Ligand binder design. Structure first.
Ligand SMILES: *[C@@H]1O[C@H](CO)[C@@H](O[C@@H]2O[C@H](CO)[C@@H](O)[C@H](O)[C@H]2NC(C)=O)[C@H](O)[C@H]1NC(C)=O
Ligand SMILES: *[C@@H]1O[C@H](CO)[C@@H](O[C@@H]2O[C@H](CO)[C@@H](O)[C@H](O)[C@H]2NC(C)=O)[C@H](O)[C@H]1NC(C)=O
Ligand SMILES: *[C@@H]1O[C@H](CO)[C@@H](O[C@@H]2O[C@H](CO)[C@@H](O)[C@H](O)[C@H]2NC(C)=O)[C@H](O)[C@H]1NC(C)=O
Ligand SMILES: *[C@@H]1O[C@H](CO)[C@@H](O[C@@H]2O[C@H](CO)[C@@H](O)[C@H](O)[C@H]2NC(C)=O)[C@H](O)[C@H]1NC(C)=O
Ligand SMILES: *[C@@H]1O[C@H](CO)[C@@H](O[C@@H]2O[C@H](CO)[C@@H](O)[C@H](O)[C@H]2NC(C)=O)[C@H](O)[C@H]1NC(C)=O
Ligand SMILES: *[C@@H]1O[C@H](CO)[C@@H](O[C@@H]2O[C@H](CO)[C@@H](O)[C@H](O)[C@H]2NC(C)=O)[C@H](O)[C@H]1NC(C)=O
Ligand SMILES: *[C@@H]1O[C@H](CO)[C@@H](O[C@@H]2O[C@H](CO)[C@@H](O)[C@H](O)[C@H]2NC(C)=O)[C@H](O)[C@H]1NC(C)=O
Ligand SMILES: *[C@@H]1O[C@H](CO)[C@@H](O)[C@H](O)[C@H]1NC(C)=O
Ligand SMILES: *[C@@H]1O[C@H](CO)[C@@H](O)[C@H](O)[C@H]1NC(C)=O
Ligand SMILES: *[C@@H]1O[C@H](CO)[C@@H](O)[C@H](O)[C@H]1NC(C)=O
Ligand SMILES: *[C@@H]1O[C@H](CO)[C@@H](O)[C@H](O)[C@H]1NC(C)=O
Ligand SMILES: *[C@@H]1O[C@H](CO)[C@@H](O)[C@H](O)[C@H]1NC(C)=O
Ligand SMILES: *[C@@H]1O[C@H](CO)[C@@H](O)[C@H](O)[C@H]1NC(C)=O
Ligand SMILES: *[C@@H]1O[C@H](CO)[C@@H](O)[C@H](O)[C@H]1NC(C)=O
Lengths: 297, 418, 87, 204, 49
């Protein structure tokens, strides 16, 4: 079939590839014992203003993301670089939860590369942003009958914000060449504008609570993981191992490599993890690809 | 401003000839790549290593991977063919006699060393000492280095023992000093010169071989031609491997990260970019490899031609088997290549003489059968062109043609009648 | 070169018929079966060399050998637009 | 017999077949048939798929042209070799070893072949060699004698001078040989008589 | 008679010219001039082109 004929001439022909398919899968996560405090982010009584968007750092905990994406309480749930259903299988070095309140019409502006008042002077996402934007209608909470003025957005700025940059200055914007010296007046504007949410507003102006999860997958040891249990350590066998999210296939063996205590893994010329430190029992394991090669007839 | 050589005004005139009175035996090294590393790439593993969804997406490109694999297979078979053609030029395996009675010539350092486990000579040991998981595999060469050494040894033995007869047909033994006499005749030197300076010639050859040994032992940049090739190959593979770290617009350069991070509808979008980038990189690598293989094939054809025309024969082509009048050559196997030790004859010490195109004896114009007429100031002799050996101008040294009213520069001298 | 399965290793040495690698080749020989062996490099032949012996041909043969060289190939043309945007 | 020509033909056929078969690849489009897309889609949506099809087919064509260029370079090299051989083996007698066949080249005959050429190399091959005892020179009257052309041989008792590539022994005379110096230098010189053709004529 | 040389020269020239002319192709972008894209579109829409 390789020669596409009902006749094979005398010779040797490379027909397929041989692989010692892995016998079993190995999961090795650190002995982590902390739950991620996502309640104080997704369950806060009062979210911060978009111009002073609140940021919380999540590290050294396990989060069951099934609850998050199985929830029907969200109107926007868009993950860029990632999917809601897969977070439970992963370990991340760090997560950032940025929370604030905007209006519905501005929700579209919270995305990588979006342009707008919010994306320009209030909160900017990078184009290579990896994470999830989760927004839900908070009309029942952030809307006052007389108008809620606790939420302010920056409407005047000299230049657009860098990604993940916060500016909380209340300095009077000087639209012209005449200095303002902290006095409101002609060509002198207060940069912060109140939303004034009211229950009678339309969907495009009702308050929306937005939480942006930024998952960072660096080379550093992972500290935020899903609810995944680690299996037993199998050596001298072809396995499908997973060390703190570092998935791979090979043979794990005890190694005489003298890792310094701060060191967690060693690489090869091809940036391939030649050895790892087991996250639970801090031993050094050599990783060697099981077996493979051409098959000739 | 660099100097172009040393300037030199030749002492040219219409009756002056410079003739060598001595000579030297030069052994020079020429190094030719013969083959490159036979590399195969699992296109599907390279692009979609162990990923079924990525392989399914990759199927959309038809037969791109299979023709890349075909190209690499052709390259590897071509490397094998190049080695075969360069080294398998001898029908039988000739082994030199235990008694090394070669007229003083010493081939100990180019002949295989029995002590070494491989049939490898001292110089080849120097040569081999000097030159130094993502679907990427290296196929071993068909002929082992020991086999190439065996071929080289057979070639050397046949050359030493039979001259150029074994290249044409059956090896006809001949004393090596008489073979050097034959080659002296071939370059235009009378063979009595070889016999009368046999010790000097042998000592010069041994000295040149020892100097070759010293140069190899000391300086390694000479083999750069081979090493260069290796480096190029290495570099390409490095490049290929490094491309797997490029996101090409995808969120990540790791397929496992995307698959464990993205749903199939979203995962496929990212995987497509990686497939595109890695496919383009593979195409680039295969193309440049084809070009380099073409270059190597040209080099190997040159090397096979040189083996034929310098080792199995004595070439009259200028500067094809080294600089100077070629005497012979000896092959030495090298990693992925070959080395030729060209033994050439270089005139060394030249004297000025007065010369004439012909000579008048009895109104007839006499011209040399072989050689040239010279004068040492008062007496006229006739000597062979490439070595000063004056002789009495007789009727056996010369031949008559016409009279003396035609030749421009003809001179008067007695032509002896034996 | 790897692991060979289904070929009977043989201590004899013959010419390379199917190259396997590292000097190992395979043939189909006798009840025939596939055999693997280290290839023979030509017939070995020591020249009867000495310092006073010469071998001289008393006869000859006229050989006519065939060499074949490609000279040209088929002159192909592709209308790029027709190939990409046929009509 | 003409495996090399059939190889070129097969290579070209394979290349063309690949080029054609690539027209069946969707390259990410709904269909690989342009007429299905145009008969199914409006221009705003049709153009999107047509762009993918164009990209894929253009890449394929570039690959084919590059491969053809390389193969053409190889063919040009082969043909240059062929013309050189035609000249040096048919229009003349070559001294290059193995350039016009194995053996001492006598002549060559061209024969046209499909897209190629065949050379019939007539060569001379020594057939039946025999052992002899040889000496670099000979001493007759304190003078060392060397063959003008050929080599000295001995059949066991007598010494002759024969041409180097054919055994035609001849009596060693002053016309077969030439003198150079004395016999205190040559290594391996043997004692033998060098006949003088003039001596019997003068004596008689 | 010097065509063998001139052609080579021409070849090289041709190639360079082609290269230069390729900078005048949109390849699907709204313009073949980069400054026009940069001077008229914001970075998010500039990057696409
Ligand atoms: C030709 O040159 C060689 C050198 O290559 C001469 O041999 C040298 O002669 C000198 C003085 O006679 C000695 O000191 C050297 O030791 C010799 N070297 C070797 C390698 O023999 C030779 O004498 C020269 N002959 C003529 C006629 O000029
Ligand atoms: C050929 O050359 C080799 C080395 O150049 C000679 O071997 C040397 O022999 C001497 C004794 O004469 C020893 O002292 C050296 O140690 C040897 N060196 C090596 C590297 O083996 C060899 O003798 C020469 N051939 C002949 C016939 O003399
Ligand atoms: C030119 O050569 C001739 C012959 O070789 C020289 O004449 C001989 O010179 C030597 C001394 O060097 C004498 O012993 C011989 O008797 C001379 N022979 C004859 C026939 O006269 C001559 O001297 C050389 N001249 C130069 C300028 O070198
Ligand atoms: C070589 O010798 C011949 C004769 O041996 C010279 O020819 C003479 O030339 C002169 C002047 O040209 C005449 O007067 C004589 O009559 C010639 N001799 C004869 C016998 O005819 C010739 O000139 C000599 N060559 C040189 C260069 O001097
Ligand atoms: C050289 O070899 C040729 C054959 O290549 C010999 O010719 C043969 O001679 C035998 C006996 O005389 C005949 O039976 C054959 O028919 C001949 N063959 C041909 C092709 O003519 C020739 O005799 C040999 N010569 C010597 C001196 O050995
Ligand atoms: C070497 O050759 C010589 C010359 O042919 C042989 O001597 C001749 O032998 C034949 C044999 O029939 C006689 O008829 C001649 O009369 C001999 N001539 C002379 C001058 O001796 C000699 O026999 C040969 N030797 C060998 C061993 O073959
Ligand atoms: C070749 O012949 C010469 C002379 O016919 C031999 O030289 C003689 O050698 C013997 C033994 O040493 C001396 O006693 C004579 O005086 C030498 N003769 C002359 C004229 O010098 C030579 O030995 C012979 N060679 C062989 C190999 O037999
Ligand atoms: C966690 O660590 C403790 C020691 O700190 C160890 O005794 C325990 O078995 C570990 N638990 C798991 C589930 O690995
Ligand atoms: C948010 O609050 C509700 C009600 O208290 C609770 O049921 C839910 O689990 C909380 N979500 C998280 C992520 O803690
Ligand atoms: C030959 O003589 C000329 C005469 O001036 C001289 O210049 C030249 O150097 C001489 N040649 C050699 C090789 O010495
Ligand atoms: C060499 O040239 C000179 C003039 O340059 C001339 O007088 C002389 O006759 C020439 N010699 C010969 C042999 O022609
Ligand atoms: C080949 O010979 C070796 C000894 O040299 C022996 O051990 C081996 O069994 C032999 N194999 C066969 C198949 O005869
Ligand atoms: C040449 O002589 C030797 C003597 O030992 C002999 O063994 C050999 O067979 C002879 N050559 C031929 C071709 O017969
Ligand atoms: C040839 O070699 C033998 C080997 O013992 C030696 O006796 C003989 O003298 C050598 N002949 C010459 C001319 O060197």
């Amino acid at each position: 079939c390789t020669l596409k004929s009902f006749t094979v001439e005398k010779g040797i022909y490379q027909t397929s590839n041989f692989r010692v398919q892995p016998t079993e899968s190995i999961v090795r996560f650190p002995n982590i014992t902390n739950l991620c405090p996502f309640g104080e982010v997704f369950n806060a009584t009062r979210f911060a203003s978009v111009y002073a968007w609140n940021r919380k750092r999540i590290s050294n905990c396990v989060a069951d993301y099934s609850v998050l994406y199985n929830s029907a309480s969200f109107s926007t749930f868009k993950c860029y670089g990632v999917s809601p259903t897969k977070l439970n299988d992963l370990c991340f070095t760090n997560v950032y939860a940025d929370s604030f309140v905007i209006r519905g019409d501005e929700v579209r502006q919270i995305a990588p590369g979006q342009t707008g008042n919010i994306a320009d002077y209030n909160y900017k996402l990078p184009d290579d942003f990896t994470g999830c934007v989760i927004a839900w209608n908070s009309n029942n909470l952030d809307s006052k009958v007389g108008g809620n003025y606790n939420y302010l957005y920056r409407l005047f700025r000299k230049s657009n914000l860098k990604p993940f940059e916060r500016d909380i200055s209340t300095e009077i914007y000087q639209a012209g060449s005449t200095p303002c010296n902290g006095v409101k007046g002609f060509n002198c504007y207060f940069p912060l504008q109140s939303y004034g949410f009211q229950p009678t507003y339309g969907v495009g102006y009702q308050p929306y609570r937005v939480v942006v999860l930024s998952f960072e997958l660096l080379h550093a040891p992972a500290t935020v993981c899903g609810p995944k249990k680690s299996t037993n350590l199998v050596k001298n066998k072809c396995v499908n191992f997973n060390f703190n999210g570092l998935t791979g296939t090979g043979v794990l063996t005890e190694s005489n490599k003298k890792f310094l205590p701060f060191q967690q893994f060693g690489r090869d010329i091809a940036d391939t993890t030649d050895a790892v430190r087991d996250p639970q029992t801090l031993e050094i394991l050599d990783i060697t690809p099981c077996s493979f090669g051409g098959v000739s007839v | 401003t660099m100097s172009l050589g040393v300037e030199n005004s030749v002492a040219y005139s219409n009756n002056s000839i410079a003739i060598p009175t001595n000579f030297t035996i030069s052994v020079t090294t020429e190094i030719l790549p013969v083959s490159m590393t036979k590399t195969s790439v699992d296109c599907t593993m390279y692009i979609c290593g162990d990923s079924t969804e990525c392989s399914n997406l990759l199927l959309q490109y038809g037969s791109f991977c299979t023709q890349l694999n075909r190209a690499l297979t052709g390259i590897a078979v071509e490397q094998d063919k190049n080695t075969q053609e360069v080294f398998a030029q001898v029908k039988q395996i000739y082994k030199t006699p235990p008694i090394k009675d070669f007229g003083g010539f010493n081939f100990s350092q180019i002949l295989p060393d029995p002590s070494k486990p491989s049939k490898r000579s001292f110089i080849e040991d120097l040569l081999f000492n000097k030159v130094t998981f993502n679907g990427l595999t290296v196929l071993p060469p068909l002929l082992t280095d020991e086999m190439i050494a065996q071929y080289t040894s057979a070639l050397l033995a046949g050359t030493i023992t039979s001259g150029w007869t074994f290249g044409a047909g059956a090896a006809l033994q001949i004393p090596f000093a008489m073979q050097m006499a034959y080659r002296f005749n071939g370059i235009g030197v009378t063979q009595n010169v070889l016999y009368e300076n046999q010790k000097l010639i042998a000592n010069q050859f041994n000295s040149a071989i020892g100097k070759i040994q010293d140069s190899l032992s000391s300086t390694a940049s000479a083999l750069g031609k081979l090493q260069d090739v290796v480096n190029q190959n290495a570099q390409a593979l490095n490049t290929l491997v490094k491309q797997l770290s490029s996101n090409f617009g995808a969120i990540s350069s790791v397929l496992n990260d995307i698959l464990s991070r993205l749903d199939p509808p979203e995962a496929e979008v990212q995987i497509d970019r990686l497939i595109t980038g890695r496919l383009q990189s593979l195409q680039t690598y295969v193309t440049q490899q084809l070009i380099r293989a073409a270059e190597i094939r040209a080099s190997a054809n040159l090397a096979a031609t040189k083996m034929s025309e310098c080792v199995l024969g004595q070439s009259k082509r200028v500067d094809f088997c080294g600089k100077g009048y070629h005497l012979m050559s000896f092959p030495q196997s090298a990693p992925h290549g070959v080395v030729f030790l060209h033994v050439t004859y270089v005139p060394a010490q030249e004297k000025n003489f007065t010369t004439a195109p012909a000579i008048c004896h009895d109104g007839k114009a006499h011209f040399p059968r072989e050689g040239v007429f010279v004068s040492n100031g008062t007496h006229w002799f006739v000597t062979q062109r490439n070595f000063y050996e004056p002789q009495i101008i007789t009727t056996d040294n010369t031949f008559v043609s016409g009279n003396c009213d035609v030749v421009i520069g003809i001179v008067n001298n007695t032509v002896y009648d034996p | 070169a790897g692991c060979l399965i289904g070929a009977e290793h043989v201590n004899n040495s013959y010419e390379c018929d199917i190259p396997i690698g590292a000097g190992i080749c395979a043939s189909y020989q006798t009840s025939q079966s596939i055999i693997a062996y280290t290839m023979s490099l030509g017939v070995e032949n020591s020249v009867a060399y000495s310092n006073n012996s010469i071998a001289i041909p008393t006869n000859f043969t006229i050989s006519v050998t065939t060499e074949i060289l490609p000279v040209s190939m088929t002159k192909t043309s592709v209308d790029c637009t027709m190939y990409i945007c046929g009509d | 017999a003409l495996g090399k020509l059939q190889d070129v033909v097969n290579q070209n056929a394979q290349a063309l077949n690949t080029l054609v078969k690539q027209l069946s690849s969707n390259f990410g489009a709904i269909s690989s048939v342009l007429n299905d897309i145009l008969s199914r889609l409006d221009p705003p949506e049709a153009e999107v798929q047509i762009d993918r099809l164009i990209t894929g087919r253009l890449q394929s064509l570039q690959t084919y042209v590059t491969q053809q260029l390389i193969r053409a370079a190889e063919i040009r090299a082969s043909a240059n070799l062929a013309a050189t051989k035609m000249s040096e083996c048919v229009l003349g007698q070559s001294k290059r070893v193995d350039f016009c066949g194995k053996g001492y080249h006598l002549m060559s005959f061209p024969q046209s072949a499909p897209h190629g050429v065949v050379f019939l190399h007539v060569t001379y091959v020594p057939a039946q060699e025999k052992n002899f005892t040889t000496a670099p020179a000979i001493c007759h009257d304190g003078k060392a004698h060397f063959p003008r052309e050929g080599v000295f041989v001995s059949n066991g008792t007598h010494w002759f001078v024969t041409q180097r590539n054919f055994y035609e022994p001849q009596i060693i005379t002053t016309d077969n040989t030439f003198v150079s110096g004395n016999c205190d230098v040559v290594i391996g010189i043997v004692n033998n008589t060098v006949y003088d053709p003039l001596q019997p004529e003068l004596d008689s």
